[PDB]
Amino acid sequence: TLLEQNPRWRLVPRGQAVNLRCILKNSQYPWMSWYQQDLQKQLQWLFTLRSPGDKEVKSLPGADYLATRVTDTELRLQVANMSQGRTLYCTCSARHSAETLYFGSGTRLTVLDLRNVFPPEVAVFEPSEAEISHTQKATLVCLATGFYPDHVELSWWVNGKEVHSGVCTDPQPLKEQPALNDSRYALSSRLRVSATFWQNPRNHFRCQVQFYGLSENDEWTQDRAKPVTQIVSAEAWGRAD
Amino acid sequence: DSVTQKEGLVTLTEGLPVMLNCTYQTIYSNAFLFWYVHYLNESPRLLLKSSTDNKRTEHQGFHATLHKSSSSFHLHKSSAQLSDSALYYCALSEGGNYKYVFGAGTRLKVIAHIQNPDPAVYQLRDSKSSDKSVCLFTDFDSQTNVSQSKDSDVYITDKCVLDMRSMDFKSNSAVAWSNKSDFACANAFNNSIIPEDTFFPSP
């Protein structure tokens, strides 16, 4: 890994600001830049700042930016006056042009009302006996429901180990009320296994949903749980024939 | 100074050839072209690159040839695989610039070839509460299309393509559910939108 970029996500209330930091881990790629990706997925260069002390500002629809090359290995960005989310990437390259551009892990920023943030409820649904009889396969379904905003990562864990074979997760969440511009979301996933594997009561299946929510730094004043970043899971054991 | 990817979305069955168009405009002699691939929950990364006119460049079955005479750098692959579903960006770097210019991106959706379809709608019970259930429409061929629901309190997901090395397990599915007590799986997957031979057991 050539770059360390932080934070990886932030919810930003309208008009407020967030600080991003990128650390270069390999001095052979000293050309450090910031790129944004808008909600239409268009990538756009913002700044390339080469020397310590270099500072420049730029305004695009949705955000005001202030970028600083602090040291030979540290690049910073303040995103302010936010009115629309975006993803920001730190990049590095060995020369200013004509070489491979490497992207950091990115910072996803979402602009919303913090009082509307909700973690998912998560449920696992056991394979149908009719599917088992008809196909000798067993599909488990995981449903994550009622969450806002839409940034979750879903994973399956079998006997304590993350699995990928047999998994299909919706590429995009669905809006529970598509007519609202602040609808909560739902996401489904399937894990398909052999019937005999599901029919073993020694086997344990868990659907894990990582939710990216509020910061501990945001003051919460409501009479429900504070919807910080958290994992919500649901589980099932196999069921003999 | 410009990069054009004329197609925003390309849907293609696995095994068929990939062609993602890219053209560019620059006054520079020293112009470097790139394809970047962007998988879900990953950052963009280089797929291949070239500044050499008429030189085939290849990476993991993808290939592209710069043709300066037609200002093109089209991305090709002989046989699409399900793991190729991703966003693809064409990009341009010129020696007089610190910026790389990225095209708008082309989404590649590779869909499965289902040799032996076995369409079925199953009802699955919550492992915690025998009250809640979901409906699973599965094993249908990739021509079958799953449209959103009209009903407000009925939720229906898009088709999900489960890629599998085992042919038996490669399969399409969609899920539906509702909090209404009137809801039955046939309310979501009714007879007009599932194949006639759908295996539809009573719950």
Side-chain angles (χ1 to χ4, degrees), chain A residues 47-79:
Chain A
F47 311 97
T48 294
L49 299 182
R50 182 71 183 71
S51 301
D54 288 347
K55 276 189 40 163
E56 164 208 344
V57 310
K58 178 159 324 183
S59 292
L60 279 75
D64 294 331
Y65 293 112
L66 165 60
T68 309
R69 181 75 172 255
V70 184
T71 75
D72 289 330
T73 56
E74 185 167 0
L75 181 72
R76 287 181 191 169
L77 182 66
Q78 196 167 84
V79 189

Side-chain angles (χ1 to χ4, degrees), chain A residues 207-222:
Chain A
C207 175
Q208 169 175 295
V209 184
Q210 174 76 70
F211 173 69
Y212 298 95
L214 279 57
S215 174
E216 60 272 13
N217 308 322
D218 300 305
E219 190 193 343
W220 188 245
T221 66
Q222 282 165 81

Side-chain angles (χ1 to χ4, degrees), chain A residues 78-90:
Chain A
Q78 196 167 84
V79 189
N81 208 26
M82 311 207 45
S83 69
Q84 184 160 127
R86 53 220 328 110
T87 291
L88 285 132
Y89 290 105
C90 179

Side-chain angles (χ1 to χ4, degrees), chain A residues 96 99 101 104 168 190 192, chain B residues 36 43 89 95 100 139 160 173:
Chain A
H96 78 272
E99 302 292 347
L101 188 67
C168 200
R190 309 99 180 117
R192 198 167 204 186
Chain B
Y36 273 70
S43 296
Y89 315 106
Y100 288 49
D139 295 349
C160 198
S173 72

Side-chain angles (χ1 to χ4, degrees), chain A residues 123-136:
Chain A
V124 173
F125 298 80
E126 299 187 353
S128 159
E129 297 279 18
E131 181 196 12
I132 291 164
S133 174
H134 193 70
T135 72
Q136 283 312 297

